């Protein structure tokens, strides 16, 4: 709590996702972290946030990284794709 | 175009135990904090100090023990202590 920023940044920098947990829940936790960082004066823009998320994608989700080498893609757009892929894996 | 991600990753994974010059450590940490700021991500004194302290090992861990909740310590103050310790370690 004293170290909220450091912990949130660390989490953002070490994200891993390959569809082993629900896409919704992953999305919710990443949104929460991005929102809290912003509220604590550390602005993570769409590009930087997308890069942190993309770099943690493994399994089939790595192909989303390969596909979006996408100028002006939003977190929302990336999360849409992730959810789509997750739904297809069920 | 991944400069911010790289710089934040560096900041989050710092390591210093006196095996390299304190000056060089300080220079690289300053460089990263400056470049982040220039790329619209200012990192305040507290957060910067926490990242540096967390990376201290060997005898430098004792600086973290002494200062973990040292309210309103500056990066400059922390760097001073690290440099002092380094100078004392030199033969």
Residue numbers in the entry:
A (entry chain A): 261 to 329, 331 to 351
B (entry chain B): 262 to 352
Task: Give me lines lifted from the publication on this model.
Saccharomyces cerevisiae prevents uncontrolled retrotransposition of Ty1 subfamilies using distinct mechanisms: canonical Ty1 is inhibited by a self-encoded restriction factor, p22/p18, whereas Ty1’ is inhibited by an endogenized restriction factor, Drt2. Although the crystal structures of p18m and Drt2m are similar, three divergent residues found in a conserved hydrophobic interface direct restriction specificity. Structural and genetic analyses of p18m reveal that p18m and Ty1 Gag interact through a hydrophobic region that is shared between both proteins, termed the Dimer-1 interface. These observations suggest a lattice-poisoning model of restriction by p18m in which the CTD binds full-length Gag and forms dead-end intermediates in VLP assembly.
Given that Ty1’ CA and Drt2 also encode p18-like domains and to understand if they had the same Dimer-1 properties as p18m, we expressed Drt2m and the equivalent residues in Ty1’ CA-CTD (Gag coordinates M259-Q351) and determined their crystal structures. Inspection of the structures reveals all helical domains with arrangements and packing resembling that of Dimer-1 observed in p18m and confirm that the F323S mutation does not alter interactions at the Dimer-1 interface. Taken together, these structures show that p18m, Ty1’ CA-CTD and Drt2m collectively share the same Dimer-1 interface responsible for restriction in the Ty1c system. All residues forming this interface are conserved apart from determinant residues 266, 270 and 312 that are AVL in Ty1c Gag and p18m and VTF in both Ty1’ Gag and Drt2m. By contrast, in Drt2m and Ty1’ CA-CTD, it is the V266 sidechain on helix α1 that closely packs against F312 on helix α3 and because of the greater steric bulk of the V and F residues the distance between the V266 and F312 Cα atoms is increased to 6.8 Å. Concurrent with the increased spacing in the VTF interface of Drt2m and Ty1’ CA-CTD, the side chain of the conserved residue R315 can adopt a rotamer that allows it to swing in and hydrogen bond with T270 which is not possible with V270 in p18m. We solved the crystal structures of Drt2m and the Ty1’ CA-CTD and find a highly similar structure to p18m.
